[PDB]
Amino acid sequence: SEKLRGQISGLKRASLNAQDGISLLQTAEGGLQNIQDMLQRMRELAVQAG
Amino acid sequence: SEKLRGQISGLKRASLNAQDGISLLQTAEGGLQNIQDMLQRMRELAVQAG
């Protein structure tokens, strides 16, 4: 019984830590998408001049 | 008759002594249960950090 109860508590904790991890990657993805947006405008502006 | 009465008195004394002994073990068991209860919250808060 004690072994099972301890395992269950650990499983809750890891389960919460999963989403705790995922949020950071989502934020980084958003920032990189903004940078990607700017780069293509700079490229088109580059090909215009010439 | 003397031997039998002496033995009967001894039997009554032992009968009381048994329960007198059992109470102490019950108390110790309760205390150990409380300690075991605390240690599991310690384990859960341990897996929290990390």
Short mmCIF file of N, CA and C in Angstrom, two decimals:
data_model
loop_
_atom_site.label_atom_id
_atom_site.label_comp_id
_atom_site.label_asym_id
_atom_site.label_seq_id
_atom_site.Cartn_x
_atom_site.Cartn_y
_atom_site.Cartn_z
N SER A 1 0.82 -1.20 0.00
CA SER A 1 0.00 0.00 0.00
C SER A 1 0.86 1.26 0.00
N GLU A 2 1.86 1.32 0.88
CA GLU A 2 2.69 2.51 0.97
C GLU A 2 3.46 2.75 -0.33
N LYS A 3 4.00 1.68 -0.91
CA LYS A 3 4.72 1.82 -2.18
C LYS A 3 3.80 2.38 -3.26
N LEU A 4 2.58 1.85 -3.35
CA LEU A 4 1.64 2.31 -4.37
C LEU A 4 1.28 3.78 -4.17
N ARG A 5 1.03 4.19 -2.92
CA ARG A 5 0.65 5.57 -2.65
C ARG A 5 1.77 6.53 -3.04
N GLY A 6 3.01 6.19 -2.67
CA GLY A 6 4.14 7.02 -3.07
C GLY A 6 4.26 7.15 -4.58
N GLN A 7 4.11 6.02 -5.29
CA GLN A 7 4.18 6.07 -6.74
C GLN A 7 3.11 6.98 -7.33
N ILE A 8 1.89 6.93 -6.77
CA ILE A 8 0.80 7.76 -7.29
C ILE A 8 1.11 9.24 -7.11
N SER A 9 1.62 9.61 -5.93
CA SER A 9 1.97 11.01 -5.71
C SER A 9 3.03 11.48 -6.70
N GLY A 10 4.08 10.68 -6.89
CA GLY A 10 5.08 11.03 -7.88
C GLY A 10 4.48 11.21 -9.26
N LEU A 11 3.47 10.39 -9.59
CA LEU A 11 2.88 10.46 -10.92
C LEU A 11 2.11 11.76 -11.15
N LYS A 12 1.30 12.18 -10.17
CA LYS A 12 0.79 13.56 -10.21
C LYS A 12 1.88 14.59 -10.44
N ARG A 13 2.98 14.50 -9.68
CA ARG A 13 3.94 15.59 -9.80
C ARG A 13 4.55 15.64 -11.20
N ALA A 14 4.93 14.49 -11.75
CA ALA A 14 5.48 14.46 -13.11
C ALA A 14 4.45 14.93 -14.14
N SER A 15 3.18 14.57 -13.93
CA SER A 15 2.12 14.97 -14.84
C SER A 15 2.00 16.48 -14.93
N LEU A 16 2.10 17.16 -13.79
CA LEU A 16 2.06 18.63 -13.82
C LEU A 16 3.32 19.20 -14.46
N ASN A 17 4.47 18.59 -14.17
CA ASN A 17 5.73 19.09 -14.71
C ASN A 17 5.75 19.04 -16.23
N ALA A 18 4.99 18.12 -16.83
CA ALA A 18 4.95 18.03 -18.29
C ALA A 18 4.46 19.33 -18.93
N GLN A 19 3.30 19.83 -18.50
CA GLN A 19 2.78 21.09 -19.04
C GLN A 19 3.67 22.26 -18.64
N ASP A 20 4.20 22.21 -17.40
CA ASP A 20 5.16 23.21 -16.97
C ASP A 20 6.30 23.34 -17.98
N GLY A 21 6.76 22.21 -18.52
CA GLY A 21 7.77 22.25 -19.56
C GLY A 21 7.25 22.77 -20.89
N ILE A 22 6.04 22.35 -21.29
CA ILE A 22 5.59 22.63 -22.65
C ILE A 22 5.38 24.13 -22.90
N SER A 23 4.99 24.88 -21.86
CA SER A 23 4.69 26.30 -22.06
C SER A 23 5.90 27.08 -22.60
N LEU A 24 7.09 26.77 -22.08
CA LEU A 24 8.30 27.48 -22.48
C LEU A 24 8.59 27.30 -23.97
N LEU A 25 8.47 26.06 -24.46
CA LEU A 25 8.70 25.80 -25.87
C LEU A 25 7.69 26.53 -26.74
N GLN A 26 6.44 26.61 -26.29
CA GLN A 26 5.46 27.37 -27.07
C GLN A 26 5.87 28.84 -27.19
N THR A 27 6.32 29.44 -26.08
CA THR A 27 6.74 30.85 -26.13
C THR A 27 7.91 31.05 -27.09
N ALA A 28 8.90 30.16 -27.02
CA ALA A 28 10.05 30.26 -27.92
C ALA A 28 9.62 30.16 -29.38
N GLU A 29 8.69 29.25 -29.67
CA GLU A 29 8.19 29.11 -31.03
C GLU A 29 7.57 30.41 -31.52
N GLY A 30 6.78 31.07 -30.67
CA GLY A 30 6.18 32.33 -31.08
C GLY A 30 7.21 33.39 -31.43
N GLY A 31 8.22 33.54 -30.58
CA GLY A 31 9.26 34.52 -30.86
C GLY A 31 9.98 34.24 -32.17
N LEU A 32 10.34 32.97 -32.39
CA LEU A 32 11.04 32.61 -33.62
C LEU A 32 10.17 32.85 -34.84
N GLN A 33 8.86 32.64 -34.71
CA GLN A 33 7.96 32.95 -35.82
C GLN A 33 7.98 34.43 -36.17
N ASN A 34 7.99 35.30 -35.15
CA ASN A 34 8.09 36.73 -35.44
C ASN A 34 9.37 37.07 -36.20
N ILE A 35 10.50 36.50 -35.76
CA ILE A 35 11.77 36.76 -36.45
C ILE A 35 11.69 36.28 -37.90
N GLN A 36 11.12 35.09 -38.11
CA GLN A 36 10.93 34.57 -39.45
C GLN A 36 10.12 35.53 -40.31
N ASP A 37 9.07 36.13 -39.73
CA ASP A 37 8.27 37.08 -40.48
C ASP A 37 9.12 38.25 -40.95
N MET A 38 9.95 38.80 -40.05
CA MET A 38 10.76 39.96 -40.44
C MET A 38 11.78 39.62 -41.54
N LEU A 39 12.36 38.42 -41.49
CA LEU A 39 13.45 38.11 -42.41
C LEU A 39 13.01 38.14 -43.87
N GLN A 40 11.81 37.62 -44.17
CA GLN A 40 11.36 37.57 -45.56
C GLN A 40 11.09 38.96 -46.12
N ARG A 41 10.55 39.86 -45.29
CA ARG A 41 10.42 41.25 -45.72
C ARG A 41 11.77 41.85 -46.05
N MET A 42 12.78 41.58 -45.21
CA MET A 42 14.11 42.09 -45.52
C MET A 42 14.64 41.51 -46.83
N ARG A 43 14.34 40.23 -47.10
CA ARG A 43 14.79 39.62 -48.35
C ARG A 43 14.13 40.26 -49.57
N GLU A 44 12.82 40.48 -49.52
CA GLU A 44 12.13 41.10 -50.65
C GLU A 44 12.62 42.53 -50.87
N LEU A 45 12.82 43.27 -49.78
CA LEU A 45 13.41 44.59 -49.89
C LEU A 45 14.82 44.53 -50.47
N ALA A 46 15.55 43.45 -50.20
CA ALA A 46 16.88 43.30 -50.78
C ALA A 46 16.81 43.08 -52.28
N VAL A 47 15.92 42.19 -52.73
CA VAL A 47 15.84 41.91 -54.16
C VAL A 47 15.29 43.12 -54.92
N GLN A 48 14.48 43.96 -54.28
CA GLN A 48 14.02 45.18 -54.94
C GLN A 48 15.20 46.07 -55.33
N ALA A 49 16.08 46.36 -54.38
CA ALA A 49 17.25 47.19 -54.67
C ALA A 49 18.23 46.41 -55.53
N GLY A 50 18.66 47.03 -56.64
CA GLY A 50 19.55 46.35 -57.56
C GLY A 50 19.29 46.65 -59.02
N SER B 1 -5.60 -28.31 48.32
CA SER B 1 -6.36 -27.06 48.28
C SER B 1 -5.44 -25.85 48.31
N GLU B 2 -4.39 -25.90 49.14
CA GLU B 2 -3.46 -24.78 49.21
C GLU B 2 -2.77 -24.55 47.87
N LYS B 3 -2.28 -25.63 47.26
CA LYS B 3 -1.61 -25.51 45.97
C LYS B 3 -2.56 -24.95 44.91
N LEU B 4 -3.79 -25.46 44.88
CA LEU B 4 -4.75 -25.01 43.87
C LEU B 4 -5.10 -23.54 44.05
N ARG B 5 -5.32 -23.09 45.29
CA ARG B 5 -5.66 -21.69 45.49
C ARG B 5 -4.50 -20.77 45.11
N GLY B 6 -3.27 -21.17 45.45
CA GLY B 6 -2.13 -20.38 45.02
C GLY B 6 -2.03 -20.26 43.51
N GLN B 7 -2.22 -21.38 42.81
CA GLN B 7 -2.18 -21.35 41.36
C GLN B 7 -3.29 -20.47 40.78
N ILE B 8 -4.48 -20.51 41.37
CA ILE B 8 -5.59 -19.69 40.87
C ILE B 8 -5.27 -18.21 41.01
N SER B 9 -4.72 -17.82 42.16
CA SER B 9 -4.33 -16.42 42.35
C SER B 9 -3.28 -15.99 41.33
N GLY B 10 -2.28 -16.84 41.10
CA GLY B 10 -1.29 -16.52 40.08
C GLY B 10 -1.91 -16.36 38.70
N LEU B 11 -2.89 -17.20 38.38
CA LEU B 11 -3.56 -17.09 37.08
C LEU B 11 -4.27 -15.75 36.93
N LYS B 12 -4.97 -15.31 37.98
CA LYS B 12 -5.64 -14.01 37.91
C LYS B 12 -4.63 -12.88 37.70
N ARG B 13 -3.50 -12.94 38.42
CA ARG B 13 -2.48 -11.91 38.25
C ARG B 13 -1.97 -11.86 36.81
N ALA B 14 -1.67 -13.02 36.23
CA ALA B 14 -1.19 -13.04 34.84
C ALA B 14 -2.26 -12.51 33.89
N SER B 15 -3.53 -12.83 34.16
CA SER B 15 -4.62 -12.35 33.32
C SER B 15 -4.65 -10.83 33.27
N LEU B 16 -4.47 -10.17 34.42
CA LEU B 16 -4.39 -8.71 34.40
C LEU B 16 -3.14 -8.22 33.66
N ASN B 17 -2.00 -8.89 33.91
CA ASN B 17 -0.73 -8.45 33.35
C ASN B 17 -0.75 -8.42 31.83
N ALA B 18 -1.48 -9.34 31.20
CA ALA B 18 -1.48 -9.40 29.73
C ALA B 18 -2.00 -8.11 29.10
N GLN B 19 -3.18 -7.66 29.52
CA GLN B 19 -3.74 -6.42 28.97
C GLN B 19 -2.89 -5.22 29.36
N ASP B 20 -2.40 -5.22 30.61
CA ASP B 20 -1.49 -4.15 31.01
C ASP B 20 -0.31 -4.03 30.05
N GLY B 21 0.20 -5.17 29.58
CA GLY B 21 1.26 -5.14 28.58
C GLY B 21 0.80 -4.65 27.22
N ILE B 22 -0.40 -5.06 26.79
CA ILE B 22 -0.82 -4.77 25.41
C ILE B 22 -1.01 -3.27 25.18
N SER B 23 -1.40 -2.53 26.22
CA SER B 23 -1.67 -1.10 26.03
C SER B 23 -0.45 -0.35 25.48
N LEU B 24 0.73 -0.65 26.01
CA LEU B 24 1.95 0.06 25.62
C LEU B 24 2.25 -0.12 24.14
N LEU B 25 2.12 -1.36 23.65
CA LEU B 25 2.36 -1.62 22.24
C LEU B 25 1.38 -0.87 21.36
N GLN B 26 0.11 -0.79 21.79
CA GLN B 26 -0.85 -0.02 21.00
C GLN B 26 -0.42 1.45 20.89
N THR B 27 0.03 2.03 22.00
CA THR B 27 0.47 3.43 21.97
C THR B 27 1.65 3.63 21.01
N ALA B 28 2.65 2.74 21.09
CA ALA B 28 3.81 2.86 20.21
C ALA B 28 3.40 2.74 18.75
N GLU B 29 2.46 1.84 18.45
CA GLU B 29 1.98 1.69 17.08
C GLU B 29 1.35 2.98 16.58
N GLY B 30 0.54 3.64 17.41
CA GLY B 30 -0.06 4.90 16.99
C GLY B 30 0.99 5.95 16.65
N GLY B 31 1.99 6.10 17.52
CA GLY B 31 3.05 7.06 17.24
C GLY B 31 3.77 6.78 15.93
N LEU B 32 4.12 5.51 15.70
CA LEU B 32 4.82 5.16 14.47
C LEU B 32 3.95 5.41 13.25
N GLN B 33 2.64 5.21 13.37
CA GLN B 33 1.75 5.52 12.26
C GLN B 33 1.80 7.00 11.91
N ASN B 34 1.79 7.87 12.93
CA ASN B 34 1.86 9.30 12.64
C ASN B 34 3.17 9.66 11.93
N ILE B 35 4.29 9.08 12.38
CA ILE B 35 5.57 9.35 11.73
C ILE B 35 5.54 8.90 10.26
N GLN B 36 5.01 7.70 10.01
CA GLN B 36 4.92 7.20 8.64
C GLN B 36 4.05 8.11 7.79
N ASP B 37 3.00 8.69 8.38
CA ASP B 37 2.17 9.63 7.64
C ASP B 37 2.97 10.85 7.20
N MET B 38 3.79 11.40 8.10
CA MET B 38 4.56 12.59 7.72
C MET B 38 5.59 12.29 6.62
N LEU B 39 6.22 11.12 6.68
CA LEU B 39 7.31 10.85 5.73
C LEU B 39 6.83 10.86 4.28
N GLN B 40 5.57 10.50 4.04
CA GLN B 40 5.09 10.44 2.66
C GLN B 40 4.89 11.83 2.07
N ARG B 41 4.39 12.77 2.87
CA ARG B 41 4.35 14.16 2.42
C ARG B 41 5.75 14.68 2.17
N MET B 42 6.72 14.26 2.99
CA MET B 42 8.11 14.61 2.70
C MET B 42 8.52 14.11 1.32
N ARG B 43 8.18 12.86 1.00
CA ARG B 43 8.56 12.30 -0.30
C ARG B 43 7.90 13.05 -1.46
N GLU B 44 6.62 13.39 -1.31
CA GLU B 44 5.93 14.11 -2.37
C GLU B 44 6.54 15.48 -2.59
N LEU B 45 6.81 16.21 -1.51
CA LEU B 45 7.47 17.50 -1.68
C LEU B 45 8.89 17.34 -2.20
N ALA B 46 9.52 16.19 -1.98
CA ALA B 46 10.83 15.93 -2.56
C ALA B 46 10.75 15.81 -4.07
N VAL B 47 9.80 15.00 -4.56
CA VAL B 47 9.67 14.86 -6.01
C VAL B 47 9.15 16.15 -6.63
N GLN B 48 8.54 17.03 -5.83
CA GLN B 48 8.16 18.35 -6.33
C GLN B 48 9.35 19.08 -6.93
N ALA B 49 10.35 19.39 -6.10
CA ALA B 49 11.55 20.07 -6.57
C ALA B 49 12.43 19.10 -7.36
N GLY B 50 13.06 19.64 -8.40
CA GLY B 50 13.88 18.83 -9.28
C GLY B 50 13.64 19.18 -10.73
#
